[model samples]
Each structure stands twice: as structure tokens, then as C-alpha cells.
Target: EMEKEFEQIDKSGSWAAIYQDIRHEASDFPCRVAKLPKNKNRNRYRDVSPFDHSRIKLHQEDNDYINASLIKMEEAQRSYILTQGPLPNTCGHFWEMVWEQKSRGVVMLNRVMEKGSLKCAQYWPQKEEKEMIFEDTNLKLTLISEDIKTYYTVRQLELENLTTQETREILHFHYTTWPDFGVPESPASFLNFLFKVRESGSLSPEHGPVVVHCSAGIGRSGTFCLADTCLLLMDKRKDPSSVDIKKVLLDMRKFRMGLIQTADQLRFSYLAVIEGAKFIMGDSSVQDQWKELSHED
Candidate 1:
């Protein structure tokens, strides 16, 4: 019913009203940790925050606070660590959360810089710089390899514990072209990237929750999670049309606030889910065209 509702909403050009309708839907729970003066610098935006109930805490740390959430879609048996991009000072904490949680993949949807503003800190070592060490956490990060595509880059990073000298491999999937407050170029392009993440086996239950982030972790990240979860549920149920987009997103908000920031992102989520459903329903032709457009654009 919601997908059909989305169709009518789209056909009647009621996106703005629909977005406005659901804009105020969020958990009114307290985020006491995020408001602490000591943790203030960790947040990217004042209005955006992780709800205390689902906020991820750093283990064995003195000041265990980071603007991140452990969002679990129980029925789908999926979990995601949704967080704002790392701040310059909280880079170590960001990595600490990943290390402690044993996450295998980090999905970054925003660039370090956007629209002349610094959206996220440069947390990973780039091409020329081989490694970066986080003194606070005693974690060392090394770039293993980088495979660049048109709209995204797949990089293998080795995260090592300097103290223990033990290392873990992390997949860094960076979707570079998604603009803030806007949808991706196309659903085909976005699904191609989503399938790449799936192919890595990183989203499987054995590993820790996949870490997903944009600037605030709720807009683009929320859209990604929403579509991904809906598709998974559909696949499990063997019916693409059985999933409910609105209910899933509303449920996700209990863990984090203000997901799918704009009407366009919400619309894109439905479109991507609709298109990807073709594949889930055993339509073989979707992948060919998806990869062609995904790589070209």
C-alpha cells in the first residue's frame, strides 16, 4: 500500500507535502551524552544527534561518547552502525568504535569536503600517504588497495592494533558523487553500488554491523539502510511488493533521528527499492543495464 501510495504521491507531485508530513517523525528520547560539553566537538551538526538508547558506546574508554548509533532491524536480521562523519578530534574514537564492534565494512556516502564546507574529516590514509596512526586508540590504518569506479571507489584497508600487532581487513566503500540533501544520479547507479557491498559478504550476520555514514548519517545513510533492509525483507519473504517503506523508516528513527532528510531522498529510496525488486523477483535483465549506466554515469 505504501509503495502504491508513493506512486500516487509521485504522480500527483506531492513530494513536498509528504516530506513535510513525516519530517517531524523522530524519537523524542534524550541524547544526554551527545550534549555533554566534552563531547560537543564530536558532532557535525547541532540539530542532528544520536538517541541515547541506541547510541554506540566506546568500550573500556574513559569518556565513552561518539555521535553514532547501533541501528538494528530485527525482523530483517540486519544491523548497521550509522554515524556522522568523523570529526578531526574524534577520528580515533570513530575508529575505536569500528575496532571494538568488529565491523568489516565502512560505507562512506559523503566526501571530506562539499560545497566549500568541510563535511567530514579525512579519517583514512589517502594514496600518497601509506599509513595513518591514531595515537589515542593506538590503532594503525594502512591502505592496501584502491579500485576506483565512476561514482564510487572500493578500497581495502588494513586496520592494525599497534599495541597487539594484530590486524583486520576492512572494506572501505566510498560513494563519492552523492550530493548533500539530494538523491544519487539514478537508482540503477545506486543499486549497482549496493550490490557490490552485498557481493563482498560484509553485510552478512557473522561480521559486526556494517558502518554507514554521510555527513550527519541520517540522510543518505538512512536512505541506503532503508532500501537495503526493505529489499532484504522482500527477498526473505519472496515477495517484492510485500515490504513497507514508511514503516521500516519510521522504525529506524527510534535508533537515530531525522532519517531521509529531504523529500527527494525518500522518493529515491522508493525508486531504488522498486527497481532493485526486479532483481529480487528473478528478473535477469536488470543487472546488465544497471551496471552499464552505473559505470557510465
Candidate 2:
């Protein structure tokens, strides 16, 4: 009997399966999801491989992995909000940043309620202890783990932290990726996700600024900021008459904090413009705007 029971534990993996089944049905994974690299690459800033960038879309039902990690970029003082919308087993490095922001007054947004009592517990920051996790600039340098929690997921933190007024200052939606890669965080899916995040918040100064990120804070976060900045500049330059150089720089400076140092990163703007326009316009009426810039469309 003891041998048989031991075998059952190994075969079923104990509560792992049960955790997954319950997490999905109960909370619906209503937070941003991302994957982190197992090992750090010493050559992260080596020459970026050249390629023509393009915009793509993906569709997932919900996101719900409580223990995934997330990264925060130190150069850019912007906040990136990711929502899984009720999926399962999400991975990423952005969990710490989200927690820090919520703990502090910098980011006050809502976490998804999970539609029932089975959701994660509410994560509310102590006003007095807000600075404990926020003062670390090195916080973004390491891969932090996001512990799995049913009721205290990002959804609850966001809901309780961000005021309704703040929520109105930005855009909110569930993101999906195209079937271009074998993994969830494929390059195509990443590009597509960035394009969507850039669509949030006001492009002009009067409406504040846009904050975009994924779990680890480098991939989706970097891409989205780069694409949006490029598009904004391109539009300002190609307007019917005069260029809004001042306004363009105002928005562009928000992303180029010196770390986004790749020509490919620079080029994503053009691709994003063409693709974003196509999605807004029907495919049939789409034209190659990149060609006009002496580039591919």
C-alpha cells in the first residue's frame, strides 16, 4: 500500500495538476504574462540581427499563472501593464515591478477580479511602506520570481492600486499573438503585442504618456516603446504640411533612454506604422508607406 501510494504521488505530480485546473476555472489569469530566459546572455547587447519587421496579432482566451516573474527597465520611468485575462501557467519577469509599483503610489491600477470569490486575494500597498521595494534601481537587473497566488494575483493588485482616474489616463485590453512561433513569446507575437500596447494612452502631452511592458520588461516592453516612438516621429515628419519636430521629440524621448540601441529597434516603427494602419484600414486599401521612406513596407 505504501509503495502504491508513493507511485500515485509521482505519477500525478501531487497538486500541480489540480492547481492548474483550478487556477484557470476560478480566476481566469487576468494579468499580463511573459517568459524569462533560463540563463542570462552575456552578449545581450551584441549587434542586433537584421531583418524586416512586421506587425502581427495573436488571440488567447485568458492568462492565469500566479507565480510568473517580470522585469522592470530602469532607464525608462514608465510603467507597463500586462493582462492575461484568464489563461493559465503564465511565466515572465515583470511580477516584481508590478508589485513594487502597486506598493508605491506610482502605479495604481486594478487587478482582474477573476469573476468570483475563487480569485486571488487583494494586494493593497501600505501607504507607509510604499518605498521599501521601489527604491531599488537594480530591481530591473535581476530576474525576479512571481510566486503563484490564487487571490492575490496582479489582477487584484491593479484593481485596488490604480485609481479610476489613473485607469482613464491609459488604455486597457487583452492581447493575443499570431501562430508564427512554437512558443508563446515568439518574435512575431512580441511585435504584435507591442503594437497593441502602443495604441493605449494619449500620444500628446496633454493626455500624459503611454506605459507598456510584458512579464520580463525587456522583450514586449522594449519593442512596444520602440515601435510607438518611431511611428509617432514618422507621422509627424510626413504630415501634409509642416513637421511637429518639438511634439515628435517630446514623445520620442520618452522611449529612447539609451538602452533601446538597435537599428532593428529603430526600424520597428516603420513596420508598426504600415501594419497598424492596415489593421485600422482594410487590407485591400493598404499601401506601402515604408517605400516612401526609402525602406521596405
In candidate 2, stretches whose alpha carbon ends up further than 4 angstroms from where it belongs are: 1-171, 178-204, 239-270, 273-297
Instruction: Write model 2 residue lDDT over 102-204, tens digit each, in one string.
Output: 3221121123232242222222232322421222111211212222222111111232122121321112322323111112233333334443234332333
Residue 119 miss distance in model 1 (angstroms): 0.6
Residue 136 of model 1 has an lDDT of 93
Clashing residue pairs in all predictions, respectively, total 0, 48
Candidate 2, residue 51: Cα displacement in angstroms equals 28
Q: Quickly count the clashes in candidate 1.
A: 0
- Output the number of the lDDT-best candidate: 1
Task: Tell me the tens digit of each residue's lDDT in model 1 across 89-115.
Answer: 989999889999999999999999899
lDDT of each: 0.90, 0.28
Every model's TM-score: 0.96, 0.30
Off by over 4 Å in 1: 1-3
> For every candidate structure, what is the RMSD over all alpha carbons to the true structure, in angstroms?
1.4, 20.6
Score residue 275 of candidate 1 by CA lDDT.
88
